[PDB]
Ligand binder design. Structure first.
Ligand SMILES: [Cu+2]
Length: 128
């Protein structure tokens, strides 16, 4: 766990954390998502989605439009820096992405795009 983090989305519509810190010195970064709840993907599905803070509202809105079968994410959305699959209870999914896509002057935000969830399920990711 030098260039990774483990993150859980649960039945209470929260991520375990609201802040991720990525070490400047990292080549790649991995986010390992799991769902320690009991609810299935339709009731309480979570993904881990990374964009700039300005792109977050568009990513969420177009995601909802996109529907459950597409993991509530617009296909091929260039705003998304990193994404997992949408997961339900007992599932897990990781994503690895290049630190270079963390462009030097940006503010970054992570969030779930399952409808409604981003009200609580969001945080900041900072390259440090
Ligand atoms: Cu969620």
């Amino acid at each position: 766990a030098e260039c990774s983090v483990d993150i859980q989305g649960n039945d209470q519509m929260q991520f375990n954390t609201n802040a991720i810190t990525v070490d400047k010195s990292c080549k790649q970064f991995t986010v390992n998502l799991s769902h320690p709840g009991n609810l299935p993907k339709n009731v309480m599905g979570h993904n881990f989605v990374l964009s700039t803070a300005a792109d977050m509202q568009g990513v969420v809105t177009d995601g909802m439009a996109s529907g459950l079968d597409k993991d509530f994410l617009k296909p091929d959305d260039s705003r998304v820096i990193a994404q997992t699959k949408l997961i339900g209870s007992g599932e897990k999914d990781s994503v690895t992405f290049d630190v270079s896509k963390l462009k030097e002057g940006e503010q970054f935000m992570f969030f779930c795009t399952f409808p409604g969830h981003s009200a609580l399920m969001y945080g900041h990711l900072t390259l440090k």
